[PDB]
Amino acid sequence: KLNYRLDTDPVQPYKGDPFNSNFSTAITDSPLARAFINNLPAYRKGLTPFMRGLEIGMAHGYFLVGPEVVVGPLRETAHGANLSGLITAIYIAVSACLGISIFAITTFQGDPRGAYGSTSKDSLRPLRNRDEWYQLNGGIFLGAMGGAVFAYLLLENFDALDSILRGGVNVN
Amino acid sequence: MNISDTQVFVALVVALLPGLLAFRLATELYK
Amino acid sequence: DMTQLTGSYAASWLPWIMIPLIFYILPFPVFALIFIWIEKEA
Amino acid sequence: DMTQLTGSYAASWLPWIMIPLIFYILPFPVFALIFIWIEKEA
Amino acid sequence: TLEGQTPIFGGGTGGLLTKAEREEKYVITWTSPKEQVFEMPTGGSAIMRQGKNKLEIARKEYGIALGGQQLRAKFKINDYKIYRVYPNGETQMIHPADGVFPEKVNQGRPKVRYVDRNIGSNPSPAKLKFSGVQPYDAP
Amino acid sequence: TVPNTISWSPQVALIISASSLLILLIASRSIKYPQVGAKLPVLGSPSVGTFVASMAFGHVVGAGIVLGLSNLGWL
Amino acid sequence: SFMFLITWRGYWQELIETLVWAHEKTPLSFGYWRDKPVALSIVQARLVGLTHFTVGYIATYGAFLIASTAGKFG
Amino acid sequence: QKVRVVVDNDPVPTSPELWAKPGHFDRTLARGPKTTTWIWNLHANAHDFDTHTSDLEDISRKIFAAHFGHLAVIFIWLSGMYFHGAKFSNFEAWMANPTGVKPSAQVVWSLVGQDILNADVGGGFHGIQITSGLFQLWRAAGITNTFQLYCTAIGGLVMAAIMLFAGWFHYHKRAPKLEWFQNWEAMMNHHLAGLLGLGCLGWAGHQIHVALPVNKLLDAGVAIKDIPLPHEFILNTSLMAELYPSFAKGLVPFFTLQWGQYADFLTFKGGLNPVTGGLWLSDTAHHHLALAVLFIVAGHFYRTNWGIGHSFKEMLDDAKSPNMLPFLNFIGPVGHEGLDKIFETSWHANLSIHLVQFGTASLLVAHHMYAMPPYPYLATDYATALSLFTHHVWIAGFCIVGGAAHAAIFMVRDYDPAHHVNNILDRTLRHRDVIISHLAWVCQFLGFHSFAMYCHNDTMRAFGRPQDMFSDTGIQLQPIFAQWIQHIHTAAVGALGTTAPGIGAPVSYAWGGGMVAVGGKVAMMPIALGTADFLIHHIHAFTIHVTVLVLFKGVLFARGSRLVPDKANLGFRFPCDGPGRGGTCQVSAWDHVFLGLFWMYNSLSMVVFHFSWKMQSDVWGTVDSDGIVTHLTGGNFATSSITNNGWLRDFLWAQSAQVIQSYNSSLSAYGLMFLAGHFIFGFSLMFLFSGRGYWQELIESIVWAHNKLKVAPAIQPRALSIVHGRAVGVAHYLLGGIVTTWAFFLARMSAIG
Amino acid sequence: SHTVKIYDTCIGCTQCVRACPTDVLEMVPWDGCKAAQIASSPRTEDCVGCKRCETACPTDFLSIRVYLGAETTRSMGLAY
Numbered sequence A: 001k002l003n004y005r006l007d008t009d010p011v012q013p014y015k016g017d018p019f020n021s022n023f024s025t026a027i028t029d030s031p032l033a034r035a036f037i038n039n040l041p042a043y044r045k046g047l048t049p050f051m052r053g054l055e056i057g058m059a060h061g062y063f064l065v066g067p068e069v070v071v072g073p074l075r076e077t078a079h080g081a082n083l084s085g086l087i088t089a090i091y092i093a094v095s096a097c098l099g100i101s102i103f104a105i106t107t108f109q110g111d112p113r114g115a116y117g118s119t120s121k122d123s124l125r126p127l128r129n130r131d132e133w134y135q136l137n138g139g140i141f142l143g144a145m146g147g148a149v150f151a152y153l154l155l156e157n158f159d160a161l162d163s164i165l166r167g168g169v170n171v172n
Numbered sequence B: 001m002n003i004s005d006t007q008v009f010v011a012l013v014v015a016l017l018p019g020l021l022a023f024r025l026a027t028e029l030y031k
Numbered sequence C, D: 001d002m003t004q005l006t007g008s009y010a011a012s013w014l015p016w017i018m019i020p021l022i023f024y025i026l027p028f029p030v031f032a033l034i035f036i037w038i039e040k041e042a
Numbered sequence E: 001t002l003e004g005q006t007p008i009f010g011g012g013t014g015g016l017l018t019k020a021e022r023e024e025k026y027v028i029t030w031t032s033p034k035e036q037v038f039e040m041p042t043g044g045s046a047i048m049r050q051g052k053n054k055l056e057i058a059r060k061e062y063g064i065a066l067g068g069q070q071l072r073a074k075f076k077i078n079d080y081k082i083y084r085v086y087p088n089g090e091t092q093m094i095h096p097a098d099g100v101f102p103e104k105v106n107q108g109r110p111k112v113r114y115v116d117r118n119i120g121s122n123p124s125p126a127k128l129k130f131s132g133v134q135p136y137d138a139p
Numbered sequence F: 001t002v003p004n005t006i007s008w009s010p011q012v013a014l015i016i017s018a019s020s021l022l023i024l025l026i027a028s029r030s031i032k033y034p035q036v037g038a039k040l041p042v043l044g045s046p047s048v049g050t051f052v053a054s055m056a057f058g059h060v061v062g063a064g065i066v067l068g069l070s071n072l073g074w075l
Numbered sequence G: 001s002f003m004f005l006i007t008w009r010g011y012w013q014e015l016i017e018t019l020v021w022a023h024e025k026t027p028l029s030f031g032y033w034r035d036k037p038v039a040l041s042i043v044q045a046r047l048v049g050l051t052h053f054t055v056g057y058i059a060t061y062g063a064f065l066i067a068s069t070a071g072k073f074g
Numbered sequence H: 001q002k003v004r005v006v007v008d009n010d011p012v013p014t015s016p017e018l019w020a021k022p023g024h025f026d027r028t029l030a031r032g033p034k035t036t037t038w039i040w041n042l043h044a045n046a047h048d049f050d051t052h053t054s055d056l057e058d059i060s061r062k063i064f065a066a067h068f069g070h071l072a073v074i075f076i077w078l079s080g081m082y083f084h085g086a087k088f089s090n091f092e093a094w095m096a097n098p099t100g101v102k103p104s105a106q107v108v109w110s111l112v113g114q115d116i117l118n119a120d121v122g123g124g125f126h127g128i129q130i131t132s133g134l135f136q137l138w139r140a141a142g143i144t145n146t147f148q149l150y151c152t153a154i155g156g157l158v159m160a161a162i163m164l165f166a167g168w169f170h171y172h173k174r175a176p177k178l179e180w181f182q183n184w185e186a187m188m189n190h191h192l193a194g195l196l197g198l199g200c201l202g203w204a205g206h207q208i209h210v211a212l213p214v215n216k217l218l219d220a221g222v223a224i225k226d227i228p229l230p231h232e233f234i235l236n237t238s239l240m241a242e243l244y245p246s247f248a249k250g251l252v253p254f255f256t257l258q259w260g261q262y263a264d265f266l267t268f269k270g271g272l273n274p275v276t277g278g279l280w281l282s283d284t285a286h287h288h289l290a291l292a293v294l295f296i297v298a299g300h301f302y303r304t305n306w307g308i309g310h311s312f313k314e315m316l317d318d319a320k321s322p323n324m325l326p327f328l329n330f331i332g333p334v335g336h337e338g339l340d341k342i343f344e345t346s347w348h349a350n351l352s353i354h355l356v357q358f359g360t361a362s363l364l365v366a367h368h369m370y371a372m373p374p375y376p377y378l379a380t381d382y383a384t385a386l387s388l389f390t391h392h393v394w395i396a397g398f399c400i401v402g403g404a405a406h407a408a409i410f411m412v413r414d415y416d417p418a419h420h421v422n423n424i425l426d427r428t429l430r431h432r433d434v435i436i437s438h439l440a441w442v443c444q445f446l447g448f449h450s451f452a453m454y455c456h457n458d459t460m461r462a463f464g465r466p467q468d469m470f471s472d473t474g475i476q477l478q479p480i481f482a483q484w485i486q487h488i489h490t491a492a493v494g495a496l497g498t499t500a501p502g503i504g505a506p507v508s509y510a511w512g513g514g515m516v517a518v519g520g521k522v523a524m525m526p527i528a529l530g531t532a533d534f535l536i537h538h539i540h541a542f543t544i545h546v547t548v549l550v551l552f553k554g555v556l557f558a559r560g561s562r563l564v565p566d567k568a569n570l571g572f573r574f575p576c577d578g579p580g581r582g583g584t585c586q587v588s589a590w591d592h593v594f595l596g597l598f599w600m601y602n603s604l605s606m607v608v609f610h611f612s613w614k615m616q617s618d619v620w621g622t623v624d625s626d627g628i629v630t631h632l633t634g635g636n637f638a639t640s641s642i643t644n645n646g647w648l649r650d651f652l653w654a655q656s657a658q659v660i661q662s663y664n665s666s667l668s669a670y671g672l673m674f675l676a677g678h679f680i681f682g683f684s685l686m687f688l689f690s691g692r693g694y695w696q697e698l699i700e701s702i703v704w705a706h707n708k709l710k711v712a713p714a715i716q717p718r719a720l721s722i723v724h725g726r727a728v729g730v731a732h733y734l735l736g737g738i739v740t741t742w743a744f745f746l747a748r749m750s751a752i753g
Numbered sequence I: 001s002h003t004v005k006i007y008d009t010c011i012g013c014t015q016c017v018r019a020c021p022t023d024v025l026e027m028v029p030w031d032g033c034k035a036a037q038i039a040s041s042p043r044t045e046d047c048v049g050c051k052r053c054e055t056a057c058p059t060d061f062l063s064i065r066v067y068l069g070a071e072t073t074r075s076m077g078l079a080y
């Protein structure tokens, strides 16, 4: 007389284990969600840790310049606004990379505690070695600096780019 | 008097609905 | 003036960014996705 | 003029650099030092 | 290895976490006379099977709560056992420790942490300064 | 402007009588529990509860139709 | 300070447990606590709440004492 | 046959023996007191009927009888308002000059100088200016003299006695069986068509035949004595036809479906009456008439005894996958199946839902009555308008907290895991960490992006950098979606084009369409929304979401958590599970209600503060002959409310002048109560910040002194329990804070309103 | 770990053992009381410090005392 009706349940236990504190939902287990998340540079199969950090830093440093350019305290002048946005991205990224370094220093002593231990099976935290974290950190810093400067150069030359993207450079 | 900025933005958001449904149909046909 | 691309229509900045996006920004990443799709081992 | 921070005292360039150093340049490295100190395995 | 069939459960958010895979985990096994609905210690309802069941739980208190307040008190099931499982695979049965429930006196059990006096005769802390001995641990 | 309402005429009687009759044909053969309670041909032999329900709903739907038509100049 | 003094520990420990679950199940969050996050102890909460209460007590009155006297005099 | 009346005859003898047996309802309390904790437990468990007995049928009978007792209390209170408005009021003087007389219905005796509180309220009368809006309500009902109020006062007392006899009768003489209480379909049919439907129809009859004729004459300017009594409009049909020609046709247009003839007294105007500033009584008559038909039709939805109708069980058992919408199938293959068991046995679950919907109803009452003032001379009576909004906002907040409280009681006591196997209730509990973690995150996002931007504004303003502030003149945060709705609703009536052509005036002038003035004061005008309104509305979003977080965590974790897995066995209301596990203080669902009460107070205080300041700044004021409006606070909301220094200075400090300077005047009572509220708030902090262990030890030394003098009581003095100290602390805290705001609001409005 | 001590005033009512939510206590043979048994705490490593045992103890003063000590993962009641 008891019918759990699990066989016809739209939401299943995650990965077939009902006692792993997770559900099989559209966000966690749909084919598109898995394809997108598992192919981000943090999870893409076969990537070296440095190459993971390079792509992550490139994307994050690029967009971190923007907020202070538009609503920052130097927004009244274009040249000052761009510099403040570049410095803000540099300061944030260097602070993050410093935190990543001290994370690697403190986490990987003996057998790491928590999700980075030898017997841990955290599929969402696959960087299990201290060397991988330092290689990732090098890519994060260099990518963030390059992405921030790339946004800085485009914003600094915005008058040239605006003429470029309108064909105004074809007058002469 | 052509359409306004709000109408263009509304059409862009509305077009997302057939965009997501086209993806759902394309993947379903791929099965 | 007729020395630049302009638009009197609403949100004329949209072609300013959408033409580069579809035609020479996104297509190479799109080709990369298709190339990965058609080369995946069984 | 009263549009900028200035100093009529000697070496008024000292607050120009010491305030950034103590308050938003060195404190994060100092926190990193303390964090490493309080997390070291026995 | 621990044998038994897991109760019918569709999944929940109160299950095991990283601690189960890193430090320790607990398993409670019991035999039921019929298929019936019980309450999971961390929320939700599960269906225990006809035969012998096996449930993985994050803390030892979950097993004592489930076995003591539900299996014994409500379902009249008195054969539940709690095991501690380590990541290396070592499994030890911890409840009931000697096969007899603790509330029932059993021969051969020694007195542990027994103080041969009433609690009002504990020495003052001033007498035990710099010795490292607490008043309740004093002879 | 106030929506137009027409004086009583055989057309409004026809609409209400027809709406009640169509509902009687449908309800006696479509609702979940007809033939419940005291009994009253082509109909499925509806009960007194089903019949009163159909006539009451015929007044509700009929009034909506006649008011809607008169509002719009016969729609 | 009223938060530390009125609300007590067990409420926050249960809330922290929920945040612990969220962190473990969120992708791209590579950080992980070396020290397990727990709610402040019962005694610690009284001390922390008393510190905020005292600091707010001194700061509020000190600002009022200086401003109400210096604003009306030298 | 299924729906029937089954009762028991004389189930409980009517004897006063148990009156002399305090605590008889509880087994523990029946033995008598040994400590003073027994006294508190007696009052705490007085109305916890499900702990008196486990018989659901006996519990339900107690609910039914006690509800008649509460109805008797309300009728006595209503009779008091009508009697005091007929014996100790200036109601007749106010009816002649509504715009120049302050309503007053309370008069104090002269013994200790308290007669100074008899204010000069106009009309040659001395008394306390009331802010309940009784006069405006009575005028809209057609009442014109104190004799009619006196008759209603007597009728209220008679109804109170009838209610009291009904409770005694239906508990001691004829108590219905449990099967009677479980007729969901019959109860809904009778309460939809028979209570809401017939009441709307009956009040529509009163409005059409009494309220509209009397109010039409009043708004035309005729004297009170020249207006005929309400029954004259029923007997002499010639009078009623002069006011509205369509009554010359009698009932013929109604039965012939020619209702357009009735358009002269069932109007659809919208807007406000220019003479009085309230809604058109003809508009409300057609509103209530449409409600009566809609409710009565709704009262034939459920299947009782004749096959026709919908069944609650069939509807609930069908709402599950795959019968749902394709994007709504996540509720699982069981869905709402099994929820019917909740409503068969759990009174607390129904009380949870119903208290929530009184919070919803009272919130709608607060918002919709200021923007669409339904009574004559209500909008321009600023003291009454502020009091009515504030009162009903506060009532809603307590009801909402009560709904969450009894939802937790249901989970601890009435919830049965066997009834909920993979259904929506079971699934909600199984992803409670998902819900609470996301709710915790959005609370932090809202707190950072609502309150911390106020701190940003304070720092920018202090720096002398107004251009960097979040303001209309700096970094703008325009509430474009709310502005768009105002434009849509204004263009709907003709003031997404004309989507409501039938309404002439704007539905509410708060959205636009013009300004209405009555006695040289603004009744309603467009309420523009800018950056300051964007910030304050997201303050409301933040505070509400946190109050939800506190209460909803308590309900979802009432059974237990990862910390204490067996809280359900510990009960709904227990102090803790000891200092172990690091400390488990206030884990029970009861302390989540206790903590949620503070957050409801904090949230609602800013709601009534937002209302009070915005209305004084941008709506209320005086209109000169040229149509120029000077507001009560001169439009300072836009620039001063964007910082909490502006709230501290321009709202709390500036607007408290009336209450702070009310000594030696008729408003001195508000000044005294202003300090009284401050005292109780500080007094409550003693209970909240301390613990009973200290107080019990202190009582030990005090008991020693009484023992030394042979005067120690037999009932041993005990410190309040841990839960009791929390209950006392929160009760005095909310009482002190609310009384402080009450005196602050009323003193200012009784002076400048 | 917490320290749980049992004193000679124990009457062997087994109420502390039944109240323990983590099975720290067991009843062992004894001769100091009529019940011929006394509470023991062999598994104090599993003690969380809830003091349910002290609440259940009927003697005056308590025959069982819990002294909160060094905090471990299982003494803090942590499932993570």
Ligand code: F6C
Residues within 6 Å of the ligand: A092, A095, A096, A098, A099, D028, D029, D031, D032, G019, G022, G023, G026, G028, G029, G030, G031, G032, H437, H438, H440, H441, H444
């Ligand atoms: C380390 C690492 C890490 C990570 C990664 O890796 C993380 C992540 C996550 C995710 C998942 C999420 C989402 C995010 C957000 O939005 O929020 C946040 C924000 C932020 C900003 C956070 C932060 C981030 C990071 C930290 C970064 C860092 C960097 C820097 C810069 C460094 C610097 C250094 C120097 C030396 C100073 C979360 C969260 C949460 N948190 Mg969590 N984290 C962590 C840390 C931490 C700590 C320490 C604490 C204590 C304070 C907490 C807290 C908290 C709370 C309360 C909550 C909530 O509510 C949320 C949630 O759950 O939802 C749902 N948490 N996080």
Ligand code: CLA
Residues within 6 Å of the ligand: H063, H064, H067, H068, H071, H180, H181, H183, H186, H187, H190, H191, H193, H194, H195
């Ligand atoms: C049309 C029929 C009808 C009406 C009007 C009501 C009305 C009411 N019921 Mg009710 N009930 C009904 C049928 C009806 N019931 C049936 C058939 C059942 C069985 C399924 C129940 C079972 C039931 C329960 C179990 C409970 C109620 C309760 C209530 C009260 C809710 C409180 C409220 O809103 O105050 C409304 C305030 C008023 C002043 C309304 C008037 C009150 C009097 C008694 C109504 C007299 C109307 C009568 C026709 C005389 C009219 C005179 C004149 C107009 C001609 C309310 C008085 C609750 C309550 O409080 O009980 C006391 C409650 O617990 N009812």
Ligand code: CLA
Residues within 6 Å of the ligand: H043, H044, H045, H046, H047, H048, H049, H351, H355, H398, H399, H400, H401, H402, H403, H405, H409, H572, H573, H590, H593, H731, H735
């Ligand atoms: C229709 C509304 C309604 C009903 C029928 C109930 C019914 C019940 N509630 Mg409940 N509740 C409600 C609304 C309601 N509540 C609301 C709105 C809230 C939010 C504040 C609560 C919060 C609440 C809690 C937190 C608890 C209950 C409990 C209970 C149960 C026992 C009643 C009790 O303890 O006696 C009441 C006895 C008292 C001594 C209270 C009187 C003291 C009040 C607080 C003082 C009020 C101050 C006064 C108005 C102003 C100042 C006065 C002046 C002299 C200074 C009972 C089933 C208790 C329970 O065990 O449930 C199973 C419980 O723990 N309720």
Ligand code: CLA
Residues within 6 Å of the ligand: D014, D015, D016, D018, D019, D022
């Ligand atoms: C304890 C004494 C003390 C205190 C509270 C301050 C306070 C301040 N100094 Mg200062 N200063 C001091 C002694 C002190 N001074 C001495 C002795 C010297 C001569 C070497 C200076 C030279 C100095 C310069 C050149 C400047 C300041 C400035 C400032 C201001 C910003 C802080 C800063 O940049 O520090 C800078 C601090 C130093 C360069 C050296 C400080 C040396 C003292 C002795 C260290 C004291 C350590 C303390 C006792 C240990 C704390 C223990 C902990 C538990 C609290 C602030 C008002 C800045 C200013 O005026 O901004 C407007 C600035 O540019 N100070």
Ligand code: CLA
Residues within 6 Å of the ligand: H140, H141, H195, H196, H197, H198, H199, H200, H203, H279, H281, H284, H287, H288, H291, H357, H358, H360, H361, H364, H365, H368, H369, H374, H375
């Ligand atoms: C939608 C319902 C509704 C609305 C908008 C009104 C509106 C009005 N009524 Mg009215 N009334 C109603 C229902 C309603 N009534 C019912 C059901 C009865 C009894 C059967 C009455 C009896 C009544 C009397 C006796 C009097 C009024 C008066 C008035 C006017 C004064 C303002 C007021 O009452 O606050 C407006 C109220 C609201 C904005 C909301 C409250 C309405 C209910 C509680 C909403 C319930 C919705 C709920 C939260 C959702 C339920 C859950 C859902 C699943 C269904 C105003 C025009 C007075 C007057 O003279 O008019 C000028 C007056 O004397 N009314």
Ligand code: CLA
Residues within 6 Å of the ligand: G001, G002, G003, G004, G006, G007, H440, H441, H443, H444, H445, H446, H447, H448, H451, H452, H455, H546, H549, H550, H595, H598, H599
């Ligand atoms: C003004 C006093 C105050 C403040 C600031 C808070 C703040 C908070 N309470 Mg809280 N509380 C208070 C009084 C206060 N409470 C009182 C009196 C009670 C008793 C009833 C409670 C009861 C209570 C409960 C029951 C709950 C909270 C919750 C929360 C959090 C809500 C999330 C949020 O807003 O994140 C944003 C954070 C803020 C708005 C805090 C101010 C941040 C400032 C403005 C910016 C700081 C800038 C920068 C970071 C500074 C760094 C400098 C460096 C040197 C340190 C937050 C930490 C809830 C929670 O934890 O949910 C997540 C919750 O459940 N509180």
Ligand SMILES: CC1=C(/C=C/C(C)=C/C=C/C(C)=C/C=C/C=C(C)/C=C/C=C(C)/C=C/C2=C(C)CCCC2(C)C)C(C)(C)CCC1
Residues within 6 Å of the ligand: A058, A059, A060, A062, A063, A142, A143, A145, A146, A147, A149, A150, A153
């Ligand atoms: C999910 C999704 C989405 C989102 C997205 C995003 C979020 C994006 C972003 C993006 C980004 C954010 C990007 C960025 C990028 C970047 C880049 C591309 C960069 C580059 C750089 C460079 C190239 C550099 C260079 C350099 C160096 C290295 C050194 C020297 C100098 C220089 C500058 C040369 C959407 C909603 C849409 C839709 C749905 C889905």
Ligand SMILES: CC1=C(/C=C/C(C)=C/C=C/C(C)=C/C=C/C=C(C)/C=C/C=C(C)/C=C/C2=C(C)CCCC2(C)C)C(C)(C)CCC1
Residues within 6 Å of the ligand: H074, H194, H195, H198, H199, H200, H202, H203
């Ligand atoms: C909300 C609230 C309130 C209230 C209010 C009011 C004012 C209400 C009202 C209500 C009402 C106002 C109701 C009514 C009802 C009615 C009814 C219920 C009726 C019935 C009727 C009938 C039943 C009839 C019958 C008949 C006869 C007798 C003869 C002929 C036939 C016929 C059938 C017609 C208060 C403030 C107090 C409190 C708080 C809350």
Ligand SMILES: CC1=C(C/C=C(\C)CCC[C@H](C)CCC[C@H](C)CCCC(C)C)C(=O)c2ccccc2C1=O
Residues within 6 Å of the ligand: H686, H687, H688, H690, H691, H692, H695, H696, H718, H719, H720, H721, H722, H724, H725, H726
């Ligand atoms: C003050 C306080 C006490 C002490 C309060 C007690 C013991 C209650 C005292 C109630 C008294 C006896 C009620 C009567 C007081 C009236 C003012 C007496 C009127 C006398 C007339 C002649 C006027 C606690 O017990 C407590 C417990 C837990 C947390 C906080 C606290 C806490 O803060």
Ligand SMILES: [Ca+2]
Residues within 6 Å of the ligand: A169, A170, A171, A172
């Ligand atoms: Ca060129």
